[PDB]
PDB file of C-alpha atoms in Angstrom:
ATOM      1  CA  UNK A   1      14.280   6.598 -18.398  1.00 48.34           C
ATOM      2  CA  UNK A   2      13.320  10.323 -18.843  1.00 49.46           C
ATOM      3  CA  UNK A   3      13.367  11.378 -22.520  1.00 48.90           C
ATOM      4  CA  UNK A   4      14.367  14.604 -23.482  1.00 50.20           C
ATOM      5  CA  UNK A   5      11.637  15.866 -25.629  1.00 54.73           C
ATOM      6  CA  UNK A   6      13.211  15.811 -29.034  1.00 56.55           C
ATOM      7  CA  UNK A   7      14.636  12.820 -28.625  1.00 54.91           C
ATOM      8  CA  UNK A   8      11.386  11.519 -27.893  1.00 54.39           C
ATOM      9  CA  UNK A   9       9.642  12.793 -30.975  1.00 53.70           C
ATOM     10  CA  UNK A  10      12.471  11.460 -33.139  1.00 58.67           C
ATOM     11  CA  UNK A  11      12.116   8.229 -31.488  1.00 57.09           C
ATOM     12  CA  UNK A  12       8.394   8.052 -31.845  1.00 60.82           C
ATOM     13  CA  UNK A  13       9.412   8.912 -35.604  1.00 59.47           C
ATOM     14  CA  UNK A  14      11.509   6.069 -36.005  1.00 62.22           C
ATOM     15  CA  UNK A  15       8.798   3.629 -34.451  1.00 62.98           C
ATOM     16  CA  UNK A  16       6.753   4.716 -37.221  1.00 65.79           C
ATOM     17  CA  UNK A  17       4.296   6.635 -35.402  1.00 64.61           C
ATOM     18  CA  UNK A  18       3.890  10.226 -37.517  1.00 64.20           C
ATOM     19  CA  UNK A  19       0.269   9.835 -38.611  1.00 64.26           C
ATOM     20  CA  UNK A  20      -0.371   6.105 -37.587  1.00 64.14           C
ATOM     21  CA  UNK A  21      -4.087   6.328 -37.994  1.00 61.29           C
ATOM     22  CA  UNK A  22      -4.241   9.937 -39.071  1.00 61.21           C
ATOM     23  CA  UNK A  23      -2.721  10.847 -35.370  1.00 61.72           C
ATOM     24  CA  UNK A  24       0.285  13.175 -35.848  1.00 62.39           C
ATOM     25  CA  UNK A  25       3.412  12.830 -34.255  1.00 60.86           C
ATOM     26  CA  UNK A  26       2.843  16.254 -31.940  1.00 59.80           C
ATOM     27  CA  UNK A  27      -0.718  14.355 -30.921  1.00 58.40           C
ATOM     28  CA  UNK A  28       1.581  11.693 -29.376  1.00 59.84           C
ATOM     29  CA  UNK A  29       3.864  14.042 -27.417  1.00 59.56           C
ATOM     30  CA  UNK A  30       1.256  16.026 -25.980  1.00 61.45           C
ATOM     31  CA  UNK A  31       0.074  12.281 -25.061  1.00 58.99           C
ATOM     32  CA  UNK A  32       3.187  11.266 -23.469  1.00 58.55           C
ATOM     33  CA  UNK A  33       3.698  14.720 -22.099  1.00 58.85           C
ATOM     34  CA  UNK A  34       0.377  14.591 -19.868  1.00 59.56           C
ATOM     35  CA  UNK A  35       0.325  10.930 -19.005  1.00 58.31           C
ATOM     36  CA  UNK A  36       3.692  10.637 -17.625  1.00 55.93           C
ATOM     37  CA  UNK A  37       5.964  13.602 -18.041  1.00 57.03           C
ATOM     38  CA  UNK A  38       8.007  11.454 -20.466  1.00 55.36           C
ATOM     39  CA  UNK A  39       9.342   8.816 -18.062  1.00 55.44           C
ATOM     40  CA  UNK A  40       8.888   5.115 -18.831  1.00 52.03           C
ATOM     41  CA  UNK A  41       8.984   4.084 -15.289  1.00 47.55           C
ATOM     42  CA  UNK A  42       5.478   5.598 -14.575  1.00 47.80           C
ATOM     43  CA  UNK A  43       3.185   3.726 -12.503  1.00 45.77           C
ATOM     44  CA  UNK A  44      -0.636   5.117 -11.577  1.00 46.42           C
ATOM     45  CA  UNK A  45      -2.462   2.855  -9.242  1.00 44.45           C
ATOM     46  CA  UNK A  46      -6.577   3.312  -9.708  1.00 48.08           C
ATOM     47  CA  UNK A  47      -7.781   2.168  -6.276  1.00 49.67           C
ATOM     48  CA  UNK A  48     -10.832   2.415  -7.619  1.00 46.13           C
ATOM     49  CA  UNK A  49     -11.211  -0.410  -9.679  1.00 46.21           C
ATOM     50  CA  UNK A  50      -7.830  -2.099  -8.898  1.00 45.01           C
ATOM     51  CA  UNK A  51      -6.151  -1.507 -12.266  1.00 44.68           C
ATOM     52  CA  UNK A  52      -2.569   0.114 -13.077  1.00 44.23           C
ATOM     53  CA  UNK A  53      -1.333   2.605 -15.715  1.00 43.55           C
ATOM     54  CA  UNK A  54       2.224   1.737 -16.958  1.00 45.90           C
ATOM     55  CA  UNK A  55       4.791   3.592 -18.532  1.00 45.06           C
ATOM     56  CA  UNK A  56       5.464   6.386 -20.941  1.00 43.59           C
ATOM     57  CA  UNK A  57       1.507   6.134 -22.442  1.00 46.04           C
ATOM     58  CA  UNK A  58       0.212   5.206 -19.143  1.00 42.50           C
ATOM     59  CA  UNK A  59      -1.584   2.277 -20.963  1.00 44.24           C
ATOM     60  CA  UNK A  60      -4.019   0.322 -18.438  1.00 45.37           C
ATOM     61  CA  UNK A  61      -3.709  -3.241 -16.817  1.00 45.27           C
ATOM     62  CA  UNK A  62      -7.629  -4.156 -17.424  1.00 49.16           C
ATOM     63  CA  UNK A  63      -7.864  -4.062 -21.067  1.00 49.03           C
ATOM     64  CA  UNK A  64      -4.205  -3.655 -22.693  1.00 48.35           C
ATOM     65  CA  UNK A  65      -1.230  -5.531 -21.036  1.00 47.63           C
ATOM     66  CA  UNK A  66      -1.113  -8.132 -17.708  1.00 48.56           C
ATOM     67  CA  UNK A  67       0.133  -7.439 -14.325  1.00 47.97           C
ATOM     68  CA  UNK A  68      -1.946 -10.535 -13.289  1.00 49.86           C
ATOM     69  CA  UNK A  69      -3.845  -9.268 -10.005  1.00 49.95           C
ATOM     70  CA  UNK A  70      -6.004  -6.859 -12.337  1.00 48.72           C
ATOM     71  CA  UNK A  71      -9.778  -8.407 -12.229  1.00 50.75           C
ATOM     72  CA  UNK A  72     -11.364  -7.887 -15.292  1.00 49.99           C
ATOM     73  CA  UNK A  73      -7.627  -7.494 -17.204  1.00 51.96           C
ATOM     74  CA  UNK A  74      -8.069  -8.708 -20.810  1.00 52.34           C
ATOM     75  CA  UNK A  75      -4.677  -8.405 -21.999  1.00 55.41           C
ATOM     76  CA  UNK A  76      -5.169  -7.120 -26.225  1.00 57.53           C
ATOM     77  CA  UNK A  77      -2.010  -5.742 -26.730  1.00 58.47           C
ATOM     78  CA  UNK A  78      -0.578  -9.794 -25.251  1.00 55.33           C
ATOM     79  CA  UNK A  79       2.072  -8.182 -23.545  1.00 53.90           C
ATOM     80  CA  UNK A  80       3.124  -8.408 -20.104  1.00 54.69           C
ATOM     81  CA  UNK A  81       3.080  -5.416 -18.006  1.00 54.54           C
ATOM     82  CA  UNK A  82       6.461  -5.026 -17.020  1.00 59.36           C
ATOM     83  CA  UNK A  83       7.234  -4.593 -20.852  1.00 61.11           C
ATOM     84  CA  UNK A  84       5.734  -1.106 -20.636  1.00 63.61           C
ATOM     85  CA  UNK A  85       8.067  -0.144 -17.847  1.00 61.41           C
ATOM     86  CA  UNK A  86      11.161  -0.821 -19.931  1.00 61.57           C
ATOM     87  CA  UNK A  87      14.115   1.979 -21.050  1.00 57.89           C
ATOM     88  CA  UNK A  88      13.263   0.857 -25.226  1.00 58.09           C
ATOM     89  CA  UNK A  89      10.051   2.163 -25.312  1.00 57.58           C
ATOM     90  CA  UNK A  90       9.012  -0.328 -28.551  1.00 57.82           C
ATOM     91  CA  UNK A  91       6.531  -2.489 -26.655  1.00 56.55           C
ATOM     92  CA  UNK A  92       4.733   0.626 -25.706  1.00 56.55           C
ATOM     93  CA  UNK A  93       4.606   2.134 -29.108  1.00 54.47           C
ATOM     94  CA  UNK A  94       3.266  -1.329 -30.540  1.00 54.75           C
ATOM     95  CA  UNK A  95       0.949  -1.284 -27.927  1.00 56.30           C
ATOM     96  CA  UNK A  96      -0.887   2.437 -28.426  1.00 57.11           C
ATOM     97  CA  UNK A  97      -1.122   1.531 -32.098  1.00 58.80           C
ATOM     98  CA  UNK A  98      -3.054  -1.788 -30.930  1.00 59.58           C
ATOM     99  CA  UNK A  99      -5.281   1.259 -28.567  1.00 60.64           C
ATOM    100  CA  UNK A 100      -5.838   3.527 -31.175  1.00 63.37           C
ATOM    101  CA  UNK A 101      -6.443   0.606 -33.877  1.00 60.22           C
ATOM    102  CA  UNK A 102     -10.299   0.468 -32.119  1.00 60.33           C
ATOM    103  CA  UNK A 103     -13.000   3.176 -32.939  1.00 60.84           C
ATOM    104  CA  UNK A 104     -12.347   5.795 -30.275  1.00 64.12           C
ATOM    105  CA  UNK A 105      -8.426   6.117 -31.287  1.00 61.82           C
ATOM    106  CA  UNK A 106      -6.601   8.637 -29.271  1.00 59.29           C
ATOM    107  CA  UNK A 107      -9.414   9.647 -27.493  1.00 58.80           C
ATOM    108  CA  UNK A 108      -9.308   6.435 -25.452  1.00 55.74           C
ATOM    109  CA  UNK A 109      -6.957   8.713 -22.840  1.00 54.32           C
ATOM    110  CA  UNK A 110      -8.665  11.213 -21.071  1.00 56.99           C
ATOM    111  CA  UNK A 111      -5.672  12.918 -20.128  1.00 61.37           C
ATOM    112  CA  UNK A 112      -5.826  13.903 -24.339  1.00 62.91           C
ATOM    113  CA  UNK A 113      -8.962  15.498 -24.920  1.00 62.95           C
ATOM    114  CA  UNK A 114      -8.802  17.448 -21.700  1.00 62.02           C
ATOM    115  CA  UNK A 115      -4.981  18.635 -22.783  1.00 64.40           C
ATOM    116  CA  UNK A 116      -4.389  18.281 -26.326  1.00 64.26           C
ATOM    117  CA  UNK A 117      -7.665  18.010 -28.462  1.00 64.52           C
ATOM    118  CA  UNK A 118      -8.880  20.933 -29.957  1.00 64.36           C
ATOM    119  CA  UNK A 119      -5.578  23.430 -28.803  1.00 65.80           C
ATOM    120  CA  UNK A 120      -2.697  24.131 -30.741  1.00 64.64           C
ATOM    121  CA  UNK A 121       0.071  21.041 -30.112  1.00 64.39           C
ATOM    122  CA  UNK A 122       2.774  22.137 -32.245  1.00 62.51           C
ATOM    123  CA  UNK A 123       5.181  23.146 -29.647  1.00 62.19           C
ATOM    124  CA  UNK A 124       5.925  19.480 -28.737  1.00 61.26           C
ATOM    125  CA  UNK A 125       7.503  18.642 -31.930  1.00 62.57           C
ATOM    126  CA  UNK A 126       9.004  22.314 -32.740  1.00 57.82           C
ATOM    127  CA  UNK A 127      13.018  22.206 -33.263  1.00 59.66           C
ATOM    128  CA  UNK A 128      13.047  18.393 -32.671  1.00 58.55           C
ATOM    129  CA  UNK A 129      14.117  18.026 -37.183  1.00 57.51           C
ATOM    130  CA  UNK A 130      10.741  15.831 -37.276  1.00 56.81           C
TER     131      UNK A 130
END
């Protein structure tokens, strides 16, 4: 699916995550926003080192869920892959609060400190009644 963006932020809401581990709800968006353009269907393969990005937080296959032909995968969030690529986007949301439960919290995705650290992200979550 392709949220709309307020319906996003009041889902993230729901799911509890409005200042999980001091990260604000419009820190999220701007997450989402950059990583896939809101669409839980996202897939980013990373020739490179033979890993995949899934779904709505593009959350990787070597350290966070399984796809099994990842070398190197470690699977902390104990979810399957395919469980990021689903419509309900609750796997995914307990799954970045399992990434941003280590030391480096949201900075653990590029894609946020290049858009959304240090610059003003309130204009994901304006109008959305969050």
């Amino acid at each position: 699916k392709v949220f709309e963006r307020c319906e996003l932020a009041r889902t993230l809401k729901r799911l509890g995550m409005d200042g999980y581990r001091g990260i604000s709800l419009a820190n999220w968006m701007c997450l989402a926003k950059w990583e896939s353009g809101y669409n839980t269907r996202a897939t980013n393969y990373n020739a490179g080192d033979r890993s995949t990005d899934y779904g709505i937080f593009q959350i990787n296959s070597r350290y966070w869920c399984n796809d099994g032909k990842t070398p190197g995968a470690v699977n902390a969030c104990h979810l399957s892959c395919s469980a990021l690529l689903q419509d309900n986007i609750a796997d995914a949301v307990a799954c970045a609060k399992r990434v941003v439960r280590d030391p480096q919290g949201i900075r653990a995705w590029v894609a946020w400190r290049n858009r959304c650290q240090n610059r003003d992200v309130r204009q994901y979550v304006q109008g959305c009644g969050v």
